[PDB]
Write a protein that binds this ligand. Structure first.
Ligand code: HEM
Ligand code: HEM
Ligand code: HEM
Ligand code: HEM
Lengths: 141, 145, 141, 145
């Protein structure tokens, strides 16, 4: 369960990210496809080259839903409902891949916001991404 | 196990690592990020806060031995299994650590590399260090019984 | 989650089991400890010898918790509250190990009740064992 | 990859398996227990009930071909990577299957062995087949890129 400090750490880190959201979403995905090649099996209809417009575009959408998730940290199961069904039942994404993406989200933020990425902010982000991806994997079976 | 292309990106970046403090930052964060792992290090003293964990001297110095273990494992990348044989036995027989925990220290170390190298820690350099930590981890898991 | 037929198969299966539930929970443990040796790290102070009376006694308590869950498939989150804590707040067992036991349980049930272990009952049990584990690993991230 | 004893437990039981059906039983249980895997097999036909799936000629026929590859890796336990190299590339480049799913087929198959051999499928016997099925899974995963 996220604590009050988790929430303010997550929100403050997200405010610093600012308008670079989709850009980081796009980088986070590419790192994921790159470091963990098996996640690429979920986007076979995608151009997956560096710079890929298609990856940029999806990057934005993933950014936008995490932003939507920063503002609903007390009822994430309500805010992520459509998305829960999509990943858990329509797409059948295995939970491990979520760890891969969450991890690459951490790397991208460590890379870009090193001053912000204190040990405590690291932990609050991990706790956050994990809670978001628990919602997105709940509707399976 | 590792291509010369990756081998260059890895040792290229490793050669720049502050060997005195990258390990203690990685181990400290393992304990901040994953609080249950702390029950394995009680001998280390004060771990009641991120500030206490992050300024703890036993934590810092155990971290250096862990980094030295990655360092030495890089020098034996073609046979990681052999280079981690006695550490696998140690973590199993003596420490009772679930190898599923090994993944968490590799990922934290990568995060520590990302935090410090920034724009230098690009997707390609990362993928290769992901390759390394996964293989170090599987080698540390090999001698469980 | 679990369908009306899922609940029906678990109950009927569990009724074939009868007096052997504790034997089976013991055997499933024996099978997890053996096939997946890393799970022994969670029991460093146990006699894990083949046929250990300690493992048998633990076997009985896993079985009893599972019988409980059969009688509460309606709201396992509440029934299993107490036990959810123990597996996070003293133990913190990695979710994978629950996969190992669930599997070693199905293998135990197939070895003793092949005629009841139809693909459809196999399927219902898998959802059940997985439903239990989900609540026993809630309390994590 | 295995010990001498493991090799005997593994090969001992495998000589007793019906090759024409254990594979079809395992794949159809794959589809029953994990219905989402039926996405991968739409060209097989009436996948609509447990009974439809369990009597389906194409499931039996595919299942057979899968088990045969399990025997191939059994002949070549020393190099599972080599033996499953081409299959690994097929599930990657062509079938786009998440290697995470490979253990579900391994597991369902171990259940079929459990079901057939009852008391003969003892804990030590099972524990060797787990080394096999995860070796097979690793090997099928090795060529993803
Ligand atoms: C941080 C957690 C994640 C979030 C917030 C997220 C969010 C999203 C969003 C916003 C969409 C777009 C839906 C739309 O365009 O209407 C989507 C779809 C999709 N997601 Fe995720 N996602 C996450 C993790 C993952 C993971 C780990 C995978 C698998 C590797 C994955 C695979 C997919 C696929 C294949 C689609 C459909 C894409 C398409 O056809 O355009 N997602 N998700
Ligand atoms: C990434 C994989 C890991 C590596 C490479 C690694 C490395 C090492 C090394 C080199 C030592 C020997 C240091 C010494 O005492 O001289 C050690 C000991 C130890 N390890 Fe790890 N470790 C890993 C994962 C873990 C994890 C995840 C935990 C706990 C959750 C853990 C718990 C311990 C403990 C408690 C000791 C003994 C510390 C002491 O008594 O001073 N290890 N490890
Ligand atoms: C099917 C899911 C599981 C169920 C229903 C279950 C059930 C139980 C029960 C009934 C207890 C009795 C203690 C009490 O009454 O407070 C217990 C404790 C315990 N469980 Fe589980 N268990 C499950 C999975 C696991 C797994 C996979 C592991 C790790 C491999 C594990 C590790 C432990 C440990 C270490 C204890 C305390 C033993 C001790 O220190 O004496 N459990 N569990
Ligand atoms: C480690 C376990 C697995 C093994 C040993 C295995 C083996 C095989 C083999 C031997 C073939 C070729 C059959 C032929 O030549 O006719 C094949 C094809 C195929 N596999 Fe697998 N496989 C495994 C896991 C999976 C999983 C988990 C899935 C998806 C959920 C999957 C989906 C498919 C599909 C769709 C084909 C093509 C079948 C067709 O011809 O229509 N496989 N596999």
């Amino acid at each position: 369960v996220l604590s009050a400090a988790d929430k303010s750490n997550v929100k403050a880190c997200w405010g610093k990210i600012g308008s670079h959201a989709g850009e980081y979403g796009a980088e986070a995905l590419e790192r994921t496809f790159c470091s963990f090649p098996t996640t690429k099996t979920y986007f076979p209809h995608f151009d997956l080259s560096h710079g890929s417009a298609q990856v940029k575009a999806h990057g934005q959408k993933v950014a936008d839903a995490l932003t939507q998730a920063v503002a609903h940290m007390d009822d994430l199961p309500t805010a992520m409902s459509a998305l829960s069904d999509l990943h858990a039942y329509k797409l059948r994404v295995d939970p491990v891949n979520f760890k891969f993406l969450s991890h690459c989200l951490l790397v991208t933020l460590a890379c870009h916001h090193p001053a912000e990425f204190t040990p405590a902010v690291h932990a609050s982000l991990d706790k956050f991404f994990s809670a978001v991806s628990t919602v997105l994997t709940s509707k399976y079976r | 196990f590792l291509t010369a292309e990756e081998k260059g990106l890895v040792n290229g970046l490793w050669g720049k690592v502050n060997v005195d403090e990258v390990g203690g930052e990685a181990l400290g964060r393992l304990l901040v990020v994953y609080p249950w792992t702390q029950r394995f290090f009680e001998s280390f003293g004060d771990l009641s806060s991120a500030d206490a964990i992050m300024s703890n001297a036993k934590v810092k110095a155990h971290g250096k031995k862990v980094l030295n273990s990655f360092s030495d494992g890089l020098k034996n990348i073609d046979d990681l299994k052999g280079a981690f044989a006695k550490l696998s036995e140690l973590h199993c027989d003596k420490l009772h650590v679930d190898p599923e925990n090994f993944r968490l220290l590799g990922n934290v170390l990568v995060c520590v590399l990302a935090h410090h190298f920034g724009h230098d820690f690009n997707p390609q350099v990362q993928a290769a260090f992901q390759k390394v930590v996964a293989g170090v981890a599987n080698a540390l898991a090999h001698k469980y019984h």
